[PDB]
Design a protein around this ligand. Structure first.
Ligand SMILES: O=c1c(O)c(-c2cc(O)c(O)c(O)c2)oc2cc(O)cc(O)c12
Ligand SMILES: O=c1c(O)c(-c2cc(O)c(O)c(O)c2)oc2cc(O)cc(O)c12
Lengths: 294, 294
């Protein structure tokens, strides 16, 4: 029993973190096979100009107590690729995967190439994440693990004025309309991930929280009319199919659960809690629930 | 910026998890040097009798794809110690430390010797933890990491009727008045960890949440009179010294912050949130705050 924000074990990613120093800038890098990936901001603006003025000996790469020799450098969008002469012997099976808003992943916060903490995050609908990063965390990566394969999905770059964070996939393509330089850019308006809230309500039922249930049901369209008023994402039919397995385990139809959520939005919780929370949590996917509530 | 429930990177602990099978029972074990630690329940009651009827070949220990040969067995309180012929080459620097109620630690949830997730926990004042464990998680360990040294503080054993969890330290001594057999035992009444709530309020101020602050101050004794009414632990003078460093960074006296907490307890939050939470969080220690809000 129990339900907690659970991150993937980080061992496979810890063995890939390195320190990249160029000039007076030091950040974190990701060492896979004979390539080190890090934010191109380390060379700091026309980055093509700045990179052409660099040489291999300008990049100091340290894997713990062993310095790696850079034999090549290249840029892929906002990510720098430093070729080294040594393939990382701890390289796990991995993939570069771009995730969707509403999906979750684990973050290994790192400083000077040294992991310090691990936690779960969701990609918000506005393509920011509500992370925990201090100065020197650039290059920390987000990831999921499927069996033995690490799917890298995020590299951290910057903090926005509202305190949320922005980054790229491992191909260097930013999530959202953000750029790796100082502008007036700010996060857009955010919405609540409706499908995740419903999954979380199912997790609550699996764990014995039932006070919010009711005998009512609603139509898909009548729920979305109420969800738009409370800044919730519209629920699609495809979201109902994904919530199908959770509906069968609990014997509660999705549209049955939607009626409870509509009641929770219109009335609040009245001093009660759900899974130890006094608000509606939207950072657990249906997969996260099944993984932890199976 | 940002504040999240952050666990320690689990790599150093993942390399110690093994699978222990005796009879038809299979659970998780902890392999350090040439010793495997696991709950004595694996031999299942007079455990001294059950253990005397066992032999080394009765214990199947598997470290991934390599079976470990048991050359000795011994019991230490509720923990079994299986001596193997191979010292774990991934053994980190480690210590066995018993923690105090109110302290936090990271849990590496494991199934069949394979890590599946990592999350933060606090030892509740009633010596239970609000974990996330499914069937087959016995032997999962809780730990802190200081620099390079892993302080193991918890081994999971059982779930109580209320859904909370109970276990021992790595010497096999239970936290709380619980025993490793089926009785009518239940968790006692719990209290809120007052010093941790105050630390969390400091983290909120460091992260820009200030709406709950006020110009009032209170005495230590007048705060405890209000804390006893809301099932909060009494605040001691020693708790004020520990909150000292957080008070200096924010320029807010501890007893100044106590007046805000008293107001929050008497009035609630009135629809507002603190660090993304609608209730008062008590599972962040002062050390956890300084570590993440430095
Ligand atoms: O991508 C960026 C980045 O990596 C860093 C950064 C700089 C350092 O000196 C570090 O030590 C560090 O960890 C990160 O700053 C930035 C500042 C911006 O305004 C915009 C950015 O895009 C980055
Ligand atoms: O300490 C205990 C324990 O380890 C297990 C357990 C049994 C299994 O068969 C497993 O596969 C497993 O992971 C754990 O059950 C218990 C059941 C009790 O009533 C009391 C206990 O103290 C334990």
């Amino acid at each position: 029993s129990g339900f907690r924000k659970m991150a993937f074990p980080s061992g496979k990613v810890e063995g890939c973190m390195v320190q990249v120093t160029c000039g007076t800038t030091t950040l974190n890098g990701l060492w896979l096979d004979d390539v080190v990936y890090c934010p191109r901001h380390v060379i700091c603006p026309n980055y093509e100009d700045l990179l052409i003025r660099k040489s291999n000996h300008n990049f100091l790469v340290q894997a713990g107590n062993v310095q790696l020799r850079v034999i090549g450098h290249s840029m892929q969008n906002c990510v720098l690729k430093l070729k080294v002469d040594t393939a990382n012997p701890k390289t796990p099976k991995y993939k570069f995967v771009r995730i969707q808003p509403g999906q979750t992943f684990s973050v290994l916060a790192c400083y000077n190439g040294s992991p310090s903490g691990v936690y779960q995050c969701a990609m918000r609908p506005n393509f920011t994440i509500k992370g925990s990063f201090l100065n020197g965390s650039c290059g920390s990566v987000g990831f999921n693990i499927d069996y033995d394969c690490v799917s890298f999905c995020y590299m951290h770059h910057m903090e926005l004025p509202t305190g949320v964070h922005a980054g790229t996939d491992l191909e260097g393509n930013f999530y959202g309309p953000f750029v790796d330089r100082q502008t007036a850019q700010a996060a857009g308006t955010d919405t609540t991930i409706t499908v995740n809230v419903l999954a979380w309500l199912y997790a609550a039922v699996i764990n014995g929280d039932r006070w919010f249930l009711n005998r009512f049901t609603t139509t898909l369209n009548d729920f979305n009319l109420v969800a738009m008023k409370y800044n919730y994402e519209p629920l699609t039919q495809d979201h109902v199919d994904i919530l199908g397995p959770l509906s069968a385990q609990t014997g509660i139809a999705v549209l049955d659960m939607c009626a409870s959520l509509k009641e929770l939005l219109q009335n609040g919780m009245n001093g009660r809690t759900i899974l130890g929370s006094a608000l509606l949590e939207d950072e657990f996917t249906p997969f996260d629930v099944v993984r932890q509530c199976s």
